Amino acid sequence: VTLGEVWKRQLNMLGKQEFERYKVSDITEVDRTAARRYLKEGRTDVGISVSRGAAKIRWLHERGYLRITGRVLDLGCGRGGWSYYAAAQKEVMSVKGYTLGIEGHEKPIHMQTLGWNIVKFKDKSNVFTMPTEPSDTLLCDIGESSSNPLVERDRTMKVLENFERWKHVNTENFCVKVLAPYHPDVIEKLERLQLRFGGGIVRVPFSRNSTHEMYYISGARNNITHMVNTTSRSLLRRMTRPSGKAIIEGDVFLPTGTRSVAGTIDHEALKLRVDQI
Numbered sequence: 001v002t003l004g005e006v007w008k009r010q011l012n013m014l015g016k017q018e019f020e021r022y023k024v025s026d027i028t029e030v031d032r033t034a035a036r037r038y039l040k041e042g043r044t045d046v047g048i049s050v051s052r053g054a055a056k057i058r059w060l061h062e063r064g065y066l067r068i069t070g071r072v073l074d075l076g077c078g079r080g081g082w083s084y085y086a087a088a089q090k091e092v093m094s095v096k097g098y099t100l101g102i103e104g105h106e107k108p109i110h111m112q113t114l115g116w117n118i119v120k121f122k123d124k125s126n127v128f129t130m131p132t133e134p135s136d137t138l139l140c141d142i143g144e145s146s147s148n149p150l151v152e153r154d155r156t157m158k159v160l161e162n163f164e165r166w167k168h169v170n171t172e173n174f175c176v177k178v179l180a181p182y183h184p185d186v187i188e189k190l191e192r193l194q195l196r197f198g199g200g201i202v203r204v205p206f207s208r209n210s211t212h213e214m215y216y217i218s219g220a221r222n223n224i225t226h227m228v229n230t231t232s233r234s235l236l237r238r239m240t241r242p243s244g245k246a247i248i249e250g251d252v253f254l255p256t257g258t259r260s261v262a263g264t265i266d267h268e269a270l271k272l273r274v275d276q277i
């Protein structure tokens with residue numbers, strides 16, 4: 001019924017070569033070659049990003065869709081790509097990342113990119129059921145794809161409901177993955193959230209054409225139905241005429257080091273934190 005649902009049915013009918021060509025058509029992509037090398041080598045002395053996901057948050061932040069400041073919460077942090085990016089940012093004071101890190105889920109990776117000392121990770125943590133805590137900036141990149149669009153609908157709904165559960169009065173800045181934005185139920189939820197919290201929905205150009213994912217963000221106001229329909233039409237237009245060519249951009253490289261921005265650096269506690277990771 002929706003253009004998004006047409007997109008998804010068509011996506012899963014594409015051949016091997018066709019799917020691969022389509023997936024990258026006209027998208028933006030970071031070259032991960034260097035980072036992947038240092039990660040297999042196991043270096044912790046190079047300021048690399050632990051995942052391709054850091055490119056998405058960098059785009060949102062640099063474009064001005066999201067201010068990243070104060071106490072940052074990262075729900076579903078995985079390896080920690082968004083957490084480490086946030087920690088490196090001038091106005092950020094602390095970062096707390098929570099993730100499952102159980103079988104078949106990514107655990108947080110230890111890295112020493114700038115502000116690694118103000119990042120705390122906790123795995124074995126289900127963000128849908130655990131106690132909440134305040135944040136000035138609330139990030140959530142949760143939304144696992146499925147061949148069943150109704151499963152994706154329900155997953156997206158859960159993410160948006162849990163966002164509202166975590167959001168505090170001071171949570172002025174936010175960025176929440178919307179896995180399957182085109183379902184009428186999801187549009188309705190987002191419209192109702194927007195009525196209370198403002199914000200808007202955006203498509204990140206680093207997202208592959210094989211996902212309809214969009215991000216509910218604090219830093220822009222727009223028409224939800226319009227933005228979603230525009231993305232559906234773009235994905236369908238790219239499918240009819242696939243370039244097979246991505247725009248390559250430089251990876252998220254960060255400086256390394258600790259940040260002092262009340263207490264002096266507790267290197268003894270830091271070692272133990274790193275030991276546990």
Ligand SMILES: Nc1ncnc2c1ncn2[C@@H]1O[C@H](C[C@@H](N)CC[C@H](N)C(=O)O)[C@@H](O)[C@H]1O
Pocket residue numbers: 050051052053054075076077078079080081082083098099100101105106125126127128141142143
């Ligand atoms: N209920 C949950 N509680 C905690 N973590 C979850 C939950 N559901 C999914 N996850 C994790 O959410 C993560 C979503 C990832 N896309 C995050 C990537 C991350 N932003 C990065 O840049 O590396 C996965 O690692 C899942 O294991």
